[PDB]
């Protein structure tokens, strides 16, 4: 009686050590485990009304007793516990803290869940059975409702907890008792006659109901009376209890008491908690299931008839975010907007008689203007859905679309990059990271662009009239004048961002015009409308081009918008726009040097690169359209060629080539030769042809000899730290000279562009053969040179090769080999290494494209030898494979050349290519992978690279063992020369550390074991079994091998 109080004081005293608290807790737990714990708890709760902590502990004892030992107690003890709980509940007073009343309600509900109504499971239960089932619970609750004000709050807590557990929460006890609990809860609240309508239950149930009129007829009058008296706390309590008893009850109760009117009245009141709970309750009423649809119609009509009230509530909730966001109303604003955004589903069911729908859409639009993006983002999905569905489209067309369009246009900005934008104030509250805000802004702008795209698709004429007005006003504004005057904007300040937003709006309009072709019914009027749309687009394009905009990034966006245009226009109007695209994009910029790698020159280089992509894509899509315009495009390109570098010269030549091939122009062979031969002619140059076999000649052409001269002139010591030594003008000049020399010396990019686009869009087998006859005369002659070039780049990484190189540059070239603007000599060496890697990747891509030519490359007898001997690089004495070449280099080699070159085999040529290629390839791969694994942050990165290489090798094996694998298995398994290296490769793969590689290799072995076991047997017995000796299947394969090998010295060797 006093030890418990002292222990509680120890537990709650801030001055007690954790050991003292733990000792006191041990004592209290001992008390809790006693047989008569509940009676002591009841005594403590009764006799200590002033001590809140001690009373709560007593109630906790009771709660543990009922909640953890209920099964143990007999009926007498259960009735005693119920009586004690009721006695404690009826004794509630004004001095009981809130958490005491919560605990008392918890006790009451815990007893009720386990004892209320269980007698009803029987038929005509006796008086004793009813009493054991708490037949009087409802009568007691009604009695508890009148004792005093404190008890009335307690009854509300009891109801809240009961209905929350029974219906909202997935409590287990009520899960078992559902069939008799849920009907009982509905019974007490619903009027008796209303209850009889839905349920057919007999009279015995009537004994469990005290108030014939139900409970709603008690709460709702109380709620209205509290609203009249403006009793905030009582209103909040009633809403808390009332918020949990709206989803489940019979709808007739909701309508009869007019709950929704009370909820709206609560909403009008300026009590934040009451408003929030009223919004939650209204949403529950809207989304809850309705058995009778007339009541649902009444509910939605009642909500929509009060759009003025909802607008007033929203206006009240609004606040100024400039100083500080009101955290007591911002959540309520989000709740309100979320509830509003769900109403639009009910629009078609409402007969507009007082402008309800117009007011609703105006309110939704007004909420969309909210400074917070999250608040706005709630309604964005509403606008997209409404525009797509023609059910609402007639209503939007009148009210909002004119204003929604203006909002969407004004809101298509880069919020994060603006200085002190009002939206960012809410960002730090709703998001805990900058990245979160950036991604949400990206999504928000995407959804906004959806709105503008759909508004222009539907109201195309209105949008176009609005668009021209917007563009004319903008480009006359001072910012527009700055944009049209400047040549390089800051890409972060207002002029550029505004212009970019304008061009995004234009892009959205063009996308809408494109969608209109699909959206508009294909009626008789379709052609006239489409011609008008095309004329409007032409006029807009002529308008935009006339501005003579020079800013590259803006000029790239304009070019891409016109690329969208061109999918529709045709004939001469197409050419007038395409020529202006070509000339404007490729216009020179005397104000800047196009080789300094400055941030303002990379913009121009990207601009010129964007056109190549767009022009090539457009040519691929619409070659027939460009057929008759080609005579003029050829002249335009010729006129523009002089002011283009090699890199873009190739792109525009590729555009012309695509038009020539895919458009069905006459004399294709002549034009093809005129375009291609001048570029590929560099391969056949006698100097390059002869010197490409000499490593030293390769070094000199790369310019390393000149670098040695430069280092000597600057007296750069062989060990001098190039990491810090600065680069000078002469260094940049030499680097530019070498790069310009290098690209034209080995036109790998030109070859890969011409071959790739040539074979891009084959339509018929005849066209494929025609192209083969077109590339064969000029690809086979150069294949030795291409493979030699790949050979040199491969041997360039071998340290011994540069041994004869001058010592001063020995460190420079070594830096170049190392993998992973330029201002230091170390960066110069890194850039040279980048040049080497770039040439190595493109020469691989040239080989893959030559593979695409099919029989031209595969059926050639020497191709396997050339390719492998050019990638192998076998040292004279040592068995090293391509010494000094990075593992990443091998990964790229395999992935980009060998896989395409293998999978790309023609099924009629596997009989001539694979036999002379698989043996050597397998030996090389085995030798390489064993060497890489023989050696086994920087080390972790190397491990990961080796894992990736092994994965690629396995993929090659998997892709070799469907239509293709069917023939490849036959080819491999019928030749020992190919099988034995393949078995070696499998044996090496299975044993490697990586788990996935071993697992997949074991699967492969299981797949083909039956076809191979037929000196293969000797190798299996001696190496495969020994090496093997994923786990279970590996053992399964081992046993499968054994069952035959040792069944047919093998067993003795295995035992050894």
């Amino acid at each position: 009686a006093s030890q418990i109080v002292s222990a509680l004081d120890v537990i709650y005293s801030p001055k007690s050590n954790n050991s003292q608290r733990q000792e006191a807790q041990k004592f209290l737990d001992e008390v809790k485990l006693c047989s008569e714990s509940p009676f002591w708890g009841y005594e403590i709760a009764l006799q200590n009304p002033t001590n809140s902590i001690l009373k709560y502990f007593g109630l906790g004892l009771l709660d543990h007793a009922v909640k953890k030992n209920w099964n143990d107690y007999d009926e007498g003890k259960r009735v005693a516990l119920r009586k004690w709980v009721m006695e404690l509940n009826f004794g509630v007073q004004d001095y009981d803290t809130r958490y005491i009343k919560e605990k008392l309600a918890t006790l009451w509900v815990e007893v009720a869940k386990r004892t209320w109504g269980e007698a009803l499971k029987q038929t005509n239960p006796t008086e004793e059975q009813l009493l054991t089932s708490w037949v009087d619970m409802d009568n007691n609750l009604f009695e508890l409702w009148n004792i005093n004000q404190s008890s009335r709050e307690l009854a509300l807590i009891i109801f809240r907890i009961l209905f929350e557990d029974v219906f909202l929460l997935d409590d287990l006890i009520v899960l078992k008792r559902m069939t008799v609990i849920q009907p009982l809860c509905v019974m007490i609240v619903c009027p008796i006659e209303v209850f009889a309508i839905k349920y057919k239950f007999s009279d015995k149930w009537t004994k469990f109901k005290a108030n014939e009129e139900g409970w709603f007829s008690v709460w709702i009058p109380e709620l209205n009376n509290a609203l009249q008296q403006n009793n905030s706390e009582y209103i909040i309590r009633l809403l808390e209890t009332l918020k949990t008893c709206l989803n489940w009850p019979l709808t007739e109760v909701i309508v009869r008491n007019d709950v929704l009117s009370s909820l709206l009245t609560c909403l009008s009141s300026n009590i934040p908690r009451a408003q929030s709970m009223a919004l939650d309750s209204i949403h529950i009423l809207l989304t809850r299931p309705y058995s009778n649809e007339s009541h649902y119609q009444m509910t939605i009509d009642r909500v929509f008839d009060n759009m003025d009230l909802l607008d007033s509530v929203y206006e009240s909730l609004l606040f100024d975010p400039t100083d500080d966001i009101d955290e007591t109303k911002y959540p309520i604003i989000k709740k309100f907007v979320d509830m509003i955004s769900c109403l639009y589903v009910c629009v078609p069911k409402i007969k507009e008689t007082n402008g309800q729908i117009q007011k609703y859409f105006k309110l939704v639009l007004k909420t969309t203007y909210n400074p917070s993006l999250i608040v706005s983002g709630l309604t964005l999905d509403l606008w997209c859905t409404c525009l797509r569905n023609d059910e609402y489209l007639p209503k939007l067309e009148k009210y909002v679309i004119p204003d929604l369009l203006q909002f969407a246009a004004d809101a298509l900005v880069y919020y994060e990059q603006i200085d002190g934008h009002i939206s960012k104030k809410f960002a730090e509250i709703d998001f805990q990271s900058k990245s979160e805000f950036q991604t949400f802004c990206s999504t928000y702008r995407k959804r906004i662009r959806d709105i503008i795209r759909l508004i222009s698709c539907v109201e195309l004429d209105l949008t176009y009239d609005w668009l021209n007005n917007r563009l004319n006003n903008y480009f006359s504004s001072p910012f527009g004048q700055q944009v049209l005057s400047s040549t390089f904007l800051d890409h972060k300040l207002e002029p550029y961002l505004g212009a970019l937003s304008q061009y995004m709006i234009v892009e959205c309009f063009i996308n809408g015009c494109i969608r209109w072709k699909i959206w508009y019914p294909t009626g008789d009027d379709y052609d006239e409308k489409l011609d008008s749309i095309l004329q409007k687009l032409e006029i807009l394009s002529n308008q935009l081009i006339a501005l003579n905009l020079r800013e590259p990034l803006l000029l790239k966006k304009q070019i891409q918008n016109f690329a969208l245009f061109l999918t529709m226009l045709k004939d001469n109007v197409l050419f007038t726009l395409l020529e202006k695209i070509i000339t404007s994009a490729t216009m020179d910029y005397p104000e800047i040097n196009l080789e300094e790698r400055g941030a303002e020159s990379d913009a121009v280089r990207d601009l010129r690169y964007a056109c190549g992509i767009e022009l090539n894509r457009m040519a691929l899509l619409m070659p027939e359209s460009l057929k008759k315009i080609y005579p003029d495009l050829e002249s335009v390109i010729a006129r523009i060629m002089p002011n283009l570098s090699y890199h873009e010269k190739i792109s525009f030549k590729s555009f012309l080539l695509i038009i020539v091939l895919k458009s069905s122009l006459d004399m294709k062979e002549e034009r093809f030769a005129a375009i291609v031969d001048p570029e590929l002619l560099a391969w056949s140059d006698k100097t390059t042809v002869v010197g490409l076999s000499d490593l030293h000649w390769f070094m000199e052409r790369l310019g390393i000899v000149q670098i040695a001269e430069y280092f000597q002139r600057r007296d750069i010591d062989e060990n001098s730290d190039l990491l810090s030594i600065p680069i000078d003008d002469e260094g940049k000049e030499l680097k530019s000279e070498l790069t310009k020399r290098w690209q034209s010396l080995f036109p790998v990019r030109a070859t890969r562009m011409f071959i790739h686009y040539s074979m891009q869009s084959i339509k018929t087998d005849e066209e494929f053969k025609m192209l083969q006859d077109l590339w064969r005369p000029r690809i086979v002659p150069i294949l030795p040179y291409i493979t030699r070039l790949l050979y040199q780049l491969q041997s360039y990484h071998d340290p011994d090769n540069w041994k004869g190189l001058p010592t001063v540059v020995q460190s420079f070239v070594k830096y170049s080999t190392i993998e992973r603007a330029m201002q230091t000599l170390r960066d110069f060496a890194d850039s040279v290494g980048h040049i080497i890697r770039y040439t190595r990747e493109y020469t691989l891509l040239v080989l893959s494209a030559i593979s695409s030519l099919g029989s031209v490359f595969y059926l050639l007898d020497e191709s396997p030898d050339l390719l492998l001997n050019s990638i192998a690089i076998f040292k004279p004495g040592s068995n090293e494979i391509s010494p000094g070449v990075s593992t990443h280099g091998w990964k790229h080699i395999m992935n980009i050349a060998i896989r395409p070159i293998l999978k790309g085999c023609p099924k009629d040529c596997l009989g001539k290519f694979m036999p002379a290629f698989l043996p050597k390839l397998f030996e090389i791969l085995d030798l390489l992978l064993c060497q890489k694994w023989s050696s086994h942050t920087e080390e972790i990165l190397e491990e990961n690279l080796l894992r990736q290489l092994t994965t690629v090798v396995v993929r090659i094996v998997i892709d070799c063992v469907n239509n293709h694998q069917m023939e490849m298995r036959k080819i491999i398994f019928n030749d020992l020369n190919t099988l034995a290296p393949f078995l070696k490769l499998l044996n090496h793969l299975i044993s490697f550390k990586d788990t996935k590689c071993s697992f997949n290799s074991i699967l492969v072995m299981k797949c083909c074991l039956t076809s191979v076991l037929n000196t293969v047997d000797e190798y299996f017995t001696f190496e495969v079994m020994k090496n093997l000796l994923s786990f279970h299947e590996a053992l399964y394969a081992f046993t499968v091998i054994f069952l035959t090998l040792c069944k047919e010295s093998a067993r003795a060797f295995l035992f050894e």
Binding site: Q22, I53, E102, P331, Q432
Partner: protein
């Protein structure tokens, strides 16, 4: 000097005790010892406007060991709900912890912390976390193994308690 009673609640093994310890000392314990009862730890912070102290009542996260499973929340002035991102059962229990946490202390600020974010495999993806915005709780992604945001919850609680959003640790 103010002193706010803070109750830290969450499923056992979620890192409540580790988080409290690492705020007491730099050490990041790795061995797991299930707290039994409650651990009271006076934790102090220095801010531009002065000093604040949180009596961090670290509650046991296991039913077998929670002595006064709810009595610890009595007179609490703020609370923190810790759930393990790597384990989705803990997040599933967050509504339960909030439910029986608001029963005792009603209007106190509550912070939901997703602990152990350092690992490469988090079963509770951020996309699946919506309880905090449902109950208007302030949510954070923290790890007492990386000190990713360890101090954020206390800063938010200090701002709410002192009614001084400009308050900042120094």
């Amino acid at each position: 000097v103010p002193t706010f009673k803070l109750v830290l609640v969450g499923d056992g093994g979620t890192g409540k005790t580790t988080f409290v310890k690492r705020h007491l000392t730099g050490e990041f314990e790795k061995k797991y010892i299930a707290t039994i009862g409650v651990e009271v730890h006076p934790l102090s912070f220095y801010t531009n406007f002065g000093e604040i102290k949180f009596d961090v009542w670290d509650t046991a996260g296991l039913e077998k060991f929670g002595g006064l499973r709810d009595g610890y929340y009595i007179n609490a002035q703020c609370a923190i709900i810790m759930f393990d991102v790597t384990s989705r059962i803990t997040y599933k229990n967050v509504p339960n912890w909030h439910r029986d946490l608001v029963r005792v202390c009603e209007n106190i600020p509550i912070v939901l912390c997703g602990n152990k974010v350092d690992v490469k495999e988090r079963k509770v993806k951020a996309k699946t976390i919506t309880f905090h915005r449902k109950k208007n709780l302030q949510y954070y992604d923290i790890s007492a193994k990386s000190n990713y945001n360890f101090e954020k919850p206390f800063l938010w609680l200090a701002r709410k308690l002192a009614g001084n959003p400009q308050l900042e640790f120094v």
